[PDB]
C-alpha cells in the first residue's frame, strides 16, 4: 500500500 | 415542488468522461511514482464506458497541456449530452493536484465549467472525481463504544479522502477509492442514485485499513472519502  | 425530481438524462449522448492519469513526475518535484494508477485508469474507463460515457484519457500531461485540454473541452458544445465527468489520478496536497511538472489548484479546473463559462452544461451535472492525497494527516482507526440558476450550481466534487489526509493506493490493484468506486459502479451504477452510490463507496473505503507497512506506525491507518454536492436533483444513470 502506498501513500498518494 | 417535486421531492423526487431527477435530472433529465435523455439526451442523445451521456457525455464525456475525461481521465487525467499521472504516474510519474518531473524529477525535481521529488514525488514518488504512482504504481497502480493505470489500473485505476483502465477500471474507470470500463465502468464509465458501460454507463454510456465517451471516455478520453491523458497520461502525464504537463500543467500547460492539461489546462489547454480542459479549456478545449469546456469550450466544445455539450448541448446533446446528459452531463460531464472529469477524473484526476495523481498526487496532491492542500487544494491542489499535480500535473507532471507543477501543481494546479482544483478551483482553476472547475471554474471553467461554471454556468457563465460553459453555457451548454447549465442545468447539467458536472462531476469531478479526485484520487490524490490532500495533506499530511494519516487518519487513525477508532471503534464505536423566472427561475434562473446560479452559475455555481450542479457540481458534484468526489474526493477519495476528506480534507487534509493521505489517500491510499495499492501498487497492483489501484487506489482504495477507485477500486471501491468502480465496484459500486459495476453493481449499482445503472440503478442507484449517484450520491447514494457514493455513500456506499464511503462505507467501503472506511472498512479498509493499511494491513502491512514498512512503517509499523502506519499499520491500521484509515481513510474516509468525502463528496460535496451542489446538485439540485436526483441523479441516475439508467441505461440509455
Ligand atoms: C499496465 As496499465 C494497467
Ligand atoms: C484508457 As483511455 C484510451
Ligand atoms: C502505507 As505502507 C508504506
Ligand atoms: C469537504 As470534502 C468535499
Tab-separated table of C-alpha atoms in Angstrom, chain B residues 58-167:
chain	number	residue	atom	x	y	z
B	58	UNK	CA	-4.494	11.755	-20.947
B	59	UNK	CA	-1.359	10.448	-19.359
B	60	UNK	CA	1.254	12.576	-17.511
B	61	UNK	CA	0.337	15.871	-19.121
B	62	UNK	CA	2.297	18.963	-18.101
B	63	UNK	CA	0.267	21.734	-16.436
B	64	UNK	CA	0.089	23.943	-19.566
B	65	UNK	CA	-1.010	20.975	-21.678
B	66	UNK	CA	-3.556	19.882	-19.085
B	67	UNK	CA	-5.015	23.397	-18.870
B	68	UNK	CA	-5.210	23.618	-22.656
B	69	UNK	CA	-7.078	20.321	-22.853
B	70	UNK	CA	-9.566	21.181	-20.134
B	71	UNK	CA	-10.146	24.611	-21.672
B	72	UNK	CA	-10.823	22.916	-25.015
B	73	UNK	CA	-13.379	20.569	-23.526
B	74	UNK	CA	-15.086	23.394	-21.598
B	75	UNK	CA	-15.488	25.237	-24.892
B	76	UNK	CA	-16.902	22.499	-27.141
B	77	UNK	CA	-20.701	22.211	-27.019
B	78	UNK	CA	-22.280	19.762	-24.559
B	79	UNK	CA	-25.782	20.564	-25.778
B	80	UNK	CA	-26.691	16.973	-26.624
B	81	UNK	CA	-25.089	15.463	-23.505
B	82	UNK	CA	-26.607	14.493	-20.156
B	83	UNK	CA	-23.584	15.506	-18.037
B	84	UNK	CA	-19.803	15.797	-17.820
B	85	UNK	CA	-17.303	13.784	-15.782
B	86	UNK	CA	-13.638	14.701	-15.088
B	87	UNK	CA	-11.283	12.439	-13.168
B	88	UNK	CA	-7.834	13.265	-11.771
B	89	UNK	CA	-5.490	10.472	-10.591
B	90	UNK	CA	-2.351	11.990	-9.106
B	91	UNK	CA	-0.532	13.341	-6.102
B	92	UNK	CA	-1.855	16.354	-4.280
B	93	UNK	CA	-1.955	18.339	-1.065
B	94	UNK	CA	-3.908	21.266	0.220
B	95	UNK	CA	-6.395	22.255	-2.535
B	96	UNK	CA	-4.210	21.225	-5.446
B	97	UNK	CA	-3.333	18.263	-7.634
B	98	UNK	CA	-0.073	17.729	-9.540
B	99	UNK	CA	0.348	17.690	-13.235
B	100	UNK	CA	3.676	16.270	-14.430
B	101	UNK	CA	5.640	19.470	-13.712
B	102	UNK	CA	3.604	21.701	-11.407
B	103	UNK	CA	0.616	21.888	-9.061
B	104	UNK	CA	-2.768	23.111	-10.240
B	105	UNK	CA	-5.395	24.444	-7.857
B	106	UNK	CA	-8.552	22.411	-8.256
B	107	UNK	CA	-10.698	25.544	-8.433
B	108	UNK	CA	-8.829	26.603	-11.608
B	109	UNK	CA	-10.086	23.481	-13.323
B	110	UNK	CA	-13.688	23.591	-12.050
B	111	UNK	CA	-14.145	27.303	-12.661
B	112	UNK	CA	-14.014	26.695	-16.408
B	113	UNK	CA	-17.306	24.767	-16.175
B	114	UNK	CA	-19.333	27.282	-14.166
B	115	UNK	CA	-22.528	28.273	-15.907
B	116	UNK	CA	-21.371	31.595	-17.270
B	117	UNK	CA	-18.263	29.957	-18.734
B	118	UNK	CA	-19.897	26.845	-20.154
B	119	UNK	CA	-23.474	27.576	-21.150
B	120	UNK	CA	-24.200	24.143	-22.658
B	121	UNK	CA	-23.672	22.446	-19.279
B	122	UNK	CA	-26.031	24.812	-17.478
B	123	UNK	CA	-28.544	22.685	-15.596
B	124	UNK	CA	-26.412	19.545	-16.084
B	125	UNK	CA	-24.328	17.607	-13.567
B	126	UNK	CA	-20.663	18.453	-13.647
B	127	UNK	CA	-18.881	15.672	-11.796
B	128	UNK	CA	-15.241	15.815	-10.656
B	129	UNK	CA	-13.532	12.811	-9.129
B	130	UNK	CA	-10.181	13.225	-7.472
B	131	UNK	CA	-7.868	10.436	-6.325
B	132	UNK	CA	-4.964	12.282	-4.646
B	133	UNK	CA	-3.617	12.992	-1.172
B	134	UNK	CA	-4.957	16.203	0.394
B	135	UNK	CA	-2.442	16.876	3.186
B	136	UNK	CA	-0.121	15.123	5.603
B	137	UNK	CA	-2.527	13.694	8.213
B	138	UNK	CA	-2.807	9.925	8.310
B	139	UNK	CA	-6.266	9.038	9.669
B	140	UNK	CA	-6.273	6.682	12.661
B	141	UNK	CA	-8.685	3.824	13.355
B	142	UNK	CA	-11.304	4.090	16.094
B	143	UNK	CA	-14.118	1.767	17.226
B	144	UNK	CA	-17.647	2.562	18.410
B	145	UNK	CA	-18.397	2.328	22.115
B	146	UNK	CA	-38.335	33.316	-13.584
B	147	UNK	CA	-36.035	30.743	-12.050
B	148	UNK	CA	-32.608	31.403	-13.346
B	149	UNK	CA	-29.851	29.173	-11.886
B	150	UNK	CA	-26.679	30.094	-10.007
B	151	UNK	CA	-23.563	29.785	-12.147
B	152	UNK	CA	-22.106	27.684	-9.312
B	153	UNK	CA	-24.906	25.068	-9.346
B	154	UNK	CA	-24.939	21.397	-10.248
B	155	UNK	CA	-21.342	20.445	-9.429
B	156	UNK	CA	-20.514	17.254	-7.576
B	157	UNK	CA	-16.973	17.011	-6.184
B	158	UNK	CA	-15.979	13.476	-5.331
B	159	UNK	CA	-12.768	13.185	-3.280
B	160	UNK	CA	-11.064	9.934	-2.382
B	161	UNK	CA	-10.425	11.268	1.161
B	162	UNK	CA	-11.570	14.036	3.466
B	163	UNK	CA	-9.665	17.265	3.697
B	164	UNK	CA	-6.102	17.258	4.928
B	165	UNK	CA	-5.434	13.498	4.756
B	166	UNK	CA	-3.321	10.950	2.958
B	167	UNK	CA	-5.111	8.709	0.453
